[PDB]
Amino acid sequence: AYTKISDVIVPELFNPYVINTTTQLSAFFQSGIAATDDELNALAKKAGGGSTLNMPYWNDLDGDSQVLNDTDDLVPQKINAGQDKAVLILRGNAWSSHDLAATLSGSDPMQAIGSRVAAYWAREMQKIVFAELAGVFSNDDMKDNKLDISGTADGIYSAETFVDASYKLGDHESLLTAIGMHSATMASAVKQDLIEFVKDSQSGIRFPTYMNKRVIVDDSMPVETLEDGTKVFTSYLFGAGALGYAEGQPEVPTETARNALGSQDILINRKHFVLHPRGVKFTENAMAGTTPTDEELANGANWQRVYDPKKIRIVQFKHRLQA
Amino acid sequence: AYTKISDVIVPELFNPYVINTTTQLSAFFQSGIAATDDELNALAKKAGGGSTLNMPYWNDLDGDSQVLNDTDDLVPQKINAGQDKAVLILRGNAWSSHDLAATLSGSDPMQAIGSRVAAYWAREMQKIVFAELAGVFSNDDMKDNKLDISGTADGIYSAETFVDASYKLGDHESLLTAIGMHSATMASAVKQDLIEFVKDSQSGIRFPTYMNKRVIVDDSMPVETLEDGTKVFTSYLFGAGALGYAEGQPEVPTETARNALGSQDILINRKHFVLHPRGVKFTENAMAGTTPTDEELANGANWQRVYDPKKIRIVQFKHRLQA
């Protein structure tokens, strides 16, 4: 062999580098949470098949608890609805190629292969969360207050419908940071509007900005087809600040093993993580398992929310493109 | 007043004794298991919500044998299906002594007061079990392979219909253990059948028996009324070996406070436990909470089950009383 801290397999000095590198290099961030508190590093420790965990709300909400005049004592006290049940998911894989890819990277990938896997799970988190929201939030009648459309024969997504969707939260504002986008939309935008290119975070270069919101480019968007040339796009608007996630940990993070009657070897990772909006609750119906559920089944139907209206915090609008 | 193992509360030496005697005394047992995997304790030890998960599977260690021919290998016995959820419940009540206090208030309660407790406690456990088990079949046909029927005025419950129900465990016979029954039925039995008192320990005493089994006399039963004053008795037959359960523990099982204005001292116990047939997985659907549920709602309706066909294992059969 070679140096190969994976093929000489020091599980120490490696795994923390892996996860940290994943956090830093990935984005999001932010947008959503980064390095969530103790609370979730605790409930992330000993657990099991859920449901999930709780996951409090935030505001203690009081301001009733009325005139203390003569005679009550006080009423100790009110709390509102509750739960917010969600999913704990499990993932992992080996590495596709042989030691071919592994040390084809080079000799001593103390930081190389780690960077590799890190970027990989970055993309993972991206896809899972994005498809998750898309699978749930839009389809029900319960969330309707957070969606706008117009989106028949007149509107371009510029400078105005962005205002409406932006203020569909009437109480809260300056809580918009990230913006989800479909490529064609930002094409229309960089045509008409002023979306400019700003090295903004320091250091590093760079990534686009509409207004001082950070924008996030993504490939996957639901795209319909109606008769008469029309195409309707989604492009969620949230940038809530934030969602949340906690790590947990499996056992045996990385295992170096080889084979015999062929020439190969295999690396593996298999990490667990817990991520979801809070936000709506995840019910248990129409799902096999477990755990986790799936990608698809983690989408297709059957979620239920309790707040309701505010402090969700996400919105969507289906807008006609630039015609 | 006394040693007050409750009232000045020595928490050692006690709660373990309460649990131990709690199992030892009341039965069931067996029938059902004792001390299955404590996985649901690693869940009971934090954390979990409703429902419980991950209680598979092992409904046998079978899979015959591995011919072992010449050069060849095996590792067969790879099988799966839907897994399970069930329930996790929490309960408790009080126990009250008085300030004027007709005394004693035991001197050596570490056997005594605990013993009374345990007696009460498991005596409630029976109520839960038989309730839920009576809750399965209520609204469903999916169990219908497991239920014989009669009521055309023929069949006595003895010596025949019991044998047919014996075959109703689909492939497997001679796995039976105990027989659940209503008192009037076994009255007809005693007037006819061979029911034979059987001493257990030598000499220690004793369980009634139908045939080489334990008989369980319980009171609350499904009881119908047709027209014509004639009646229908259900009387489950399982002797499966088994149901299942595991405990976990809260914080602070034992606590002591007294009342000022009133004249009392009060006690509480409150242990958590899991019980359910495996057997159907319990749905969280169209029902209250949360958590745990009820007696009633743990009975009324809306359950769903996955194995299926056999190795469940319970059957009910309905018949007229002797005539």
Next chain:
Amino acid sequence: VDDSMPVETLEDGTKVFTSYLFGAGALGYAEGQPEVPTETARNALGSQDILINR
């Protein structure tokens, strides 16, 4: 910015809003003080404890 404003409805389409203009500089307030600002107490017959301010 504030959430609560009186909002009327005149039939039709009109909506009339309030949105006070003051910024006087100022109003005024003084605290005073009660007795027992914060009291830590618990319960028995259940698992809780309670904090209070008043």
